[PDB]
């Protein structure tokens, strides 16, 4: 079988403070990213649905709120669901991270 991370798993991940700490996986959650081709010719495949001012159809014209607070016109390409992990640290703080920010233990 392929290795997997599951709820309750003791692992090592990055705290919001940037440092690594042992933590526990509280639950698996799916994050959905949107991909769009901007009118200016560039494209982003890591926007969140909250950045559009179900998902639109490929080619559909949409307005995207960028990181600069400005709105740009674009056409929707596709949505990308990605398996992610909600982990909780010693102080009780919690975070949703990707596979690459998680280091598993042998037991």
């Amino acid at each position: 079988a392929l290795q997997s991370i599951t709820a309750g798993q003791k692992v090592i991940s990055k705290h919001k403070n940037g440092r690594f700490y042992q933590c526990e996986v509280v639950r698996l959650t799916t994050e959905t990213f949107y991909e769009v081709n901007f009118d200016d010719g560039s494209f982003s495949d890591n926007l969140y649905p909250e950045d559009i001012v179900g998902p639109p159809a490929e080619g559909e014209v949409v307005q995207v709120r960028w990181t600069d607070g400005q709105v740009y016109g674009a056409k929707f390409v596709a949505s990308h669901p990605i398996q992610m992990y909600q982990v909780e640290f010693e102080d009780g703080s919690q975070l949703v991270v990707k596979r690459d920010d998680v280091y598993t233990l042998d037991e």
Binding site: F38, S42, F43, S44, N46, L47, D51, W66, T67
Partner: peptide
């Protein structure tokens, strides 16, 4: 991640 590019 909100990153853009022309590829």
């Amino acid at each position: 991640a909100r990153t853009k590019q022309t590829a």
